[PDB]
Paper text:
During an analysis of Acinetobacter baumannii strain AB 5075 genome we have identified an open reading frame (ORF) encoding a protein with the proposed muramidase activity that structurally resembles bacteriophage endolysins. Conservative domain (aa 40–177) is typical for phage endolysins and bacterial autolysins, and usually degrades peptidoglycan by a N-acetyl-β-d-muramidase activity utilizing a Glu-Asp-Thr catalytic triad. AcLys, one of such “naturally artilyzed” protein with the C-terminal α-helical domain demonstrates moderate activity against viable Gram-negative bacteria from outside.
The crystal structure of AcLys was refined to 1.2 Å resolution. The final model comprises one subunit of the protein (149 residues), 229 water molecules as well as sulfate and glycerol molecules. The protein has overall α-helical architecture typical for lysozyme family, and is composed of seven α-helices: α2: residues 54–64, α3: 101–122, α4: 129–142, α5: 144–149, α6: 151–157, α7: 161–170 and α8: 180–193. Active site is formed by conserved catalytic triad: Glu64, Asp73 and Thr79 are clearly seen in the electron density. Glu64 forms salt bridge to conserved Arg185 which lies on the C-terminal helix α8. This salt bridge is a well-known feature of the known endolysins of P21 and P22 families. In case of AcLys the loop harbors an increased number of positively charged residues, including conserved Arg185, Arg186, Arg190 and Lys180 (also found in case of DLP12 endolysin from E. coli), unique Arg184—which is a part of positively charged patch consisting of three arginines, as well as Lys195 and Lys196. These residues surround the loop forming positive charge on their surface and thus could potentially bind and penetrate the cell membrane.
Residue numbers in the entry: 48 to 196
The structure:
């Protein structure tokens, strides 16, 4: 939109998401495949037993990535570094657009309060309503990227 996710950003998100050939349970029962895909671009939901090629996974990932880029570009009104944009997209890829849009993160960010926004990454550590240690790690990493310059 304004910005797009950098190659480094994509590599980070991919490291968090993984790239899987077989549909798998994300931990809370949501069948996921490729690089974090749960809904194919045609609207079909991922199901247990699906398989996905590398090329398919890339297509699906890039399709969803563009959605989240659009959210960050449109919803954030404060200036962003590329690192900040990348971090916010990584977060949004996980929490979704609605969660991002209604977050205290975004409220602080749009006041120009970068530090307060950075710290708000850390609240997004839940899956299935439960704190998940992989998300705790991920949020810390996204926050670090957000603060990196």
């Amino acid at each position: 939109g304004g910005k797009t996710t950098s190659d480094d950003g994509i590599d980070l998100i991919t490291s968090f998401e993984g790239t899987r050939f077989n549909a798998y349970d994300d931990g809370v029962g949501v069948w996921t495949i490729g690089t974090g895909t749960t809904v194919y671009p045609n609207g079909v939901k991922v199901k247990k037993g699906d398989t996905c090629t590398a090329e398919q996974a890339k297509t699906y990932f890039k399709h969803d990535l563009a959605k989240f880029e659009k959210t960050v570009n449109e919803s954030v009104t404060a200036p962003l570094t590329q690192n900040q944009f990348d971090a916010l997209v990584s977060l949004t890829y996980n929490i979704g657009s609605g969660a991002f849009n209604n977050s205290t993160l975004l409220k602080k960010l749009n006041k120009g309060d970068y530090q307060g926004a950075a710290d708000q990454f850390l609240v997004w550590n839940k899956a299935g309503g439960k704190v998940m240690k992989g998300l705790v790690r991920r949020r810390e990493a996204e926050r670090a990227l957000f603060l990196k310059k």
